[PDB]
Write an enzyme that holds these catalytic residues in place. Structure first.
Site, PDB file in Angstrom:
ATOM      1  N   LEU A  17      52.840  72.784  14.875  1.00 11.02           N
ATOM      2  CA  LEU A  17      52.512  73.504  13.650  1.00 11.02           C
ATOM      3  C   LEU A  17      51.965  74.896  13.953  1.00 11.02           C
ATOM      4  CD1 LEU A  17      50.875  70.666  11.503  1.00 11.02           C
ATOM      5  CD2 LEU A  17      53.263  71.424  11.574  1.00 11.02           C
ATOM      6  N   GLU A  18      45.558  73.218  18.621  1.00 14.41           N
ATOM      7  CA  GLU A  18      46.798  72.571  19.034  1.00 14.41           C
ATOM      8  C   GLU A  18      47.159  71.416  18.106  1.00 14.41           C
ATOM      9  OE1 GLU A  18      49.125  73.307  22.180  1.00 14.41           O
ATOM     10  OE2 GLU A  18      48.393  74.816  20.763  1.00 14.41           O
ATOM     11  N   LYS A  34      46.253  66.135  16.505  1.00 15.70           N
ATOM     12  CA  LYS A  34      45.499  67.199  17.150  1.00 15.70           C
ATOM     13  C   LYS A  34      45.145  66.821  18.579  1.00 15.70           C
ATOM     14  CE  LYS A  34      41.793  70.149  15.906  1.00 15.70           C
ATOM     15  N   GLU A  75      46.684  61.454   8.664  1.00 16.54           N
ATOM     16  CA  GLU A  75      47.797  61.485   7.728  1.00 16.54           C
ATOM     17  C   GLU A  75      48.354  62.899   7.629  1.00 16.54           C
ATOM     18  OE1 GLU A  75      47.075  61.267   3.445  1.00 16.54           O
ATOM     19  OE2 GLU A  75      44.919  61.304   3.861  1.00 16.54           O
ATOM     20  N   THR A  78      52.299  67.037   3.193  1.00 14.20           N
ATOM     21  CA  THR A  78      53.626  67.650   3.180  1.00 14.20           C
ATOM     22  C   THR A  78      53.657  69.174   3.034  1.00 14.20           C
ATOM     23  OG1 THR A  78      54.484  65.621   2.150  1.00 14.20           O
ATOM     24  CG2 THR A  78      55.913  67.559   2.118  1.00 14.20           C
ATOM     25  N   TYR A  79      52.838  69.718   2.139  1.00 10.54           N
ATOM     26  CA  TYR A  79      52.981  71.122   1.758  1.00 10.54           C
ATOM     27  C   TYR A  79      52.061  72.088   2.504  1.00 10.54           C
ATOM     28  CZ  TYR A  79      55.733  69.193  -2.049  1.00 10.54           C
ATOM     29  OH  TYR A  79      56.684  68.526  -2.786  1.00 10.54           O
ATOM     30  N   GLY A  80      51.262  71.573   3.432  1.00 17.66           N
ATOM     31  CA  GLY A  80      50.412  72.428   4.243  1.00 17.66           C
ATOM     32  C   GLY A  80      49.165  72.908   3.526  1.00 17.66           C
ATOM     33  N   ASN A  81      48.620  74.039   3.969  1.00 15.66           N
ATOM     34  CA  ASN A  81      47.333  74.499   3.458  1.00 15.66           C
ATOM     35  C   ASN A  81      47.423  75.029   2.027  1.00 15.66           C
ATOM     36  OD1 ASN A  81      47.024  77.732   3.414  1.00 15.66           O
ATOM     37  ND2 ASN A  81      48.396  77.173   5.100  1.00 15.66           N
ATOM     38  N   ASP A 122      32.829  75.006   6.516  1.00 14.10           N
ATOM     39  CA  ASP A 122      33.971  75.915   6.478  1.00 14.10           C
ATOM     40  C   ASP A 122      34.873  75.604   5.290  1.00 14.10           C
ATOM     41  OD1 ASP A 122      35.469  78.072   7.286  1.00 14.10           O
ATOM     42  OD2 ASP A 122      36.605  76.970   8.808  1.00 14.10           O
ATOM     43  N   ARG A 126      42.129  77.787   2.891  1.00 15.68           N
ATOM     44  CA  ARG A 126      42.880  77.638   4.133  1.00 15.68           C
ATOM     45  C   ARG A 126      42.614  76.291   4.803  1.00 15.68           C
ATOM     46  NH1 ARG A 126      38.794  81.384   5.013  1.00 15.68           N
ATOM     47  NH2 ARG A 126      37.154  80.657   6.442  1.00 15.68           N
ATOM     48  N   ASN A 127      41.507  75.653   4.434  1.00 10.58           N
ATOM     49  CA  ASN A 127      41.125  74.378   5.034  1.00 10.58           C
ATOM     50  C   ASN A 127      41.290  73.201   4.080  1.00 10.58           C
ATOM     51  OD1 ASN A 127      40.409  75.371   7.618  1.00 10.58           O
ATOM     52  ND2 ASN A 127      38.442  76.088   6.809  1.00 10.58           N
ATOM     53  N   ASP A 140      38.547  67.412   7.092  1.00  5.84           N
ATOM     54  CA  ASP A 140      37.213  66.968   7.478  1.00  5.84           C
ATOM     55  C   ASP A 140      37.059  66.875   8.992  1.00  5.84           C
ATOM     56  OD1 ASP A 140      38.932  64.870   7.848  1.00  5.84           O
ATOM     57  OD2 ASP A 140      37.934  63.502   6.454  1.00  5.84           O
TER      58      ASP A 140
HETATM   59  C1  LIG Z   1      45.444  66.764  13.137  1.00  4.61           C
HETATM   60  O1  LIG Z   1      45.144  67.126  11.799  1.00  4.61           O
HETATM   61  C2  LIG Z   1      44.886  68.501  11.588  1.00  4.61           C
HETATM   62  C3  LIG Z   1      44.124  69.212  12.488  1.00  4.61           C
HETATM   63  C4  LIG Z   1      43.871  70.555  12.269  1.00  4.61           C
HETATM   64  C5  LIG Z   1      44.385  71.187  11.135  1.00  4.61           C
HETATM   65  O2  LIG Z   1      44.133  72.532  10.917  1.00  4.61           O
HETATM   66  C6  LIG Z   1      45.140  70.477  10.233  1.00  4.61           C
HETATM   67  C7  LIG Z   1      45.391  69.134  10.450  1.00  4.61           C
HETATM   68  C8  LIG Z   1      46.228  68.340   9.462  1.00  4.61           C
HETATM   69  C9  LIG Z   1      45.997  67.052   9.036  1.00  4.61           C
HETATM   70  N1  LIG Z   1      46.956  66.698   8.176  1.00  4.61           N
HETATM   71  C10 LIG Z   1      47.825  67.702   8.001  1.00  4.61           C
HETATM   72  N2  LIG Z   1      48.950  67.802   7.223  1.00  4.61           N
HETATM   73  C11 LIG Z   1      49.708  68.890   7.166  1.00  4.61           C
HETATM   74  C12 LIG Z   1      49.389  70.025   7.926  1.00  4.61           C
HETATM   75  C13 LIG Z   1      50.281  71.269   7.831  1.00  4.61           C
HETATM   76  C14 LIG Z   1      51.681  71.144   7.789  1.00  4.61           C
HETATM   77  N3  LIG Z   1      52.465  72.207   7.699  1.00  4.61           N
HETATM   78  C15 LIG Z   1      51.965  73.436   7.638  1.00  4.61           C
HETATM   79  C16 LIG Z   1      50.578  73.652   7.674  1.00  4.61           C
HETATM   80  C17 LIG Z   1      50.002  75.037   7.596  1.00  4.61           C
HETATM   81  O3  LIG Z   1      49.372  75.364   6.572  1.00  4.61           O
HETATM   82  N4  LIG Z   1      50.149  76.000   8.675  1.00  4.61           N
HETATM   83  C18 LIG Z   1      50.882  75.666   9.922  1.00  4.61           C
HETATM   84  C19 LIG Z   1      49.565  77.307   8.528  1.00  4.61           C
HETATM   85  C20 LIG Z   1      49.701  72.547   7.763  1.00  4.61           C
HETATM   86  C21 LIG Z   1      48.214  69.989   8.765  1.00  4.61           C
HETATM   87  C22 LIG Z   1      47.437  68.775   8.778  1.00  4.61           C
END
Ligand SMILES: COc1ccc(O)cc1-c1c[nH]c2ncc(-c3cncc(C(=O)N(C)C)c3)cc12
Length: 258
Positions: A17, A18, A34, A75, A78-81, A122, A126-127, A140
């Site tokens: 997407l 470490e 992660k 978990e 799907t749609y990211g941040n 935080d 974005r989070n 979390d």
């Molecule tokens: C191990 O879990 C984490 C540890 C760090 C972190 O920053 C997040 C996650 C986390 C958990 N569930 C998730 N589900 C979906 C996505 C995710 C999918 N696609 C795009 C994006 C995105 O916005 N960018 C790449 C900018 C984020 C992330 C996560």
């Protein structure tokens, strides 16, 4: 804690997407992974997530903490941040009632953290992560243990996200659940503006001086007055004057149900 323990080869990395998008092979399930910040901090972060159970907090699924490299498996949303989601969305679909629904979900998560003696430190768009049907979950991963009445003092020389940061934190490196409430107010503003950057054009080095003279961001275009009143309440200078997340969540559930 070993009920959580998994073999590293139970997961396959698919996309970086470490943080990785991965596959829990046994269940054919897409997961977020992660991998390894120092080791002990990473392991504590995993330990804390084991105690978190809430529909609007990202759910831990397993860990790999026997032999390096270490995995934290959660978990997948799907749609990211939330920040990018709001900026790129169809606003006719993601309309006023959907924004209220999102705020209600987030405040519900924070009410849970409040009741369970955790702080986030935080809180920002974005989070937050977005799933199908405007489901929102708070990341979390950086939770800290703290009795709600107490204060956490950040280490010497810590760097903050200034425009999301409460005044007592900017000046004294002090954090509490009330400092999260301040951040929530900024998150509300982000949601109301569909992901605009806070205090537009305002130099970062003058943010604190502005805040102490009672400068606050103006009401966003199209933002309901009651929602703005909540923002302003979150931005009270005195931490103890700011509302609890229980009160905040109750206010939003009322609005959303009406
Ligand atoms: C191990 O879990 C984490 C540890 C760090 C972190 O920053 C997040 C996650 C986390 C958990 N569930 C998730 N589900 C979906 C996505 C995710 C999918 N696609 C795009 C994006 C995105 O916005 N960018 C790449 C900018 C984020 C992330 C996560």
């Amino acid at each position: 804690y070993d009920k959580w323990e998994m073999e590293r080869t139970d997961i396959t990395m698919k996309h970086k997407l470490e943080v990785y998008e991965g596959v829990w092979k046994k269940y054919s399930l897409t997961v977020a992974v992660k991998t390894l910040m120092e080791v002990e901090e990473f392991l504590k972060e995993a330990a804390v997530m084991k105690e978190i159970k809430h529909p609007n907090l990202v759910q831990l699924l397993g860990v790999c903490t026997r032999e390096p490299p270490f995995y934290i498996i959660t978990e997948f949303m799907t749609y990211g941040n939330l920040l990018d989601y709001l900026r790129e969305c169809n606003r006719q679909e993601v309309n006023a009632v959907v924004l209220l629904y999102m705020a209600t979900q987030i405040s519900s998560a924070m009410e849970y953290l409040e009741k369970k003696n955790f702080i986030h430190r935080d809180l920002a768009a974005r989070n937050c992560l977005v799933g199908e049907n405007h489901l929102v979950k708070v990341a979390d991963f950086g939770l800290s243990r703290l009795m709600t009445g107490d204060t956490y003092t950040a280490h010497a020389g810590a760097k903050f996200p200034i425009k999301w940061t409460a005044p007592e934190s900017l000046a004294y490196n002090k954090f509490s659940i009330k400092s999260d409430v301040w951040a929530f107010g900024v998150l509300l503003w982000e949601i109301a503006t569909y992901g605009m950057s806070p205090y537009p054009g305002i130099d970062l080095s003058q943010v604190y001086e502005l805040l102490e003279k009672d400068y606050r961001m103006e009401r966003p275009e199209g933002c309901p007055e009651k929602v703005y009143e909540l923002m302003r309440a979150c931005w009270q200078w005195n931490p103890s004057d700011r509302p609890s997340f229980a009160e905040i969540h109750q206010a939003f559930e009322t609005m959303f149900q009406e």
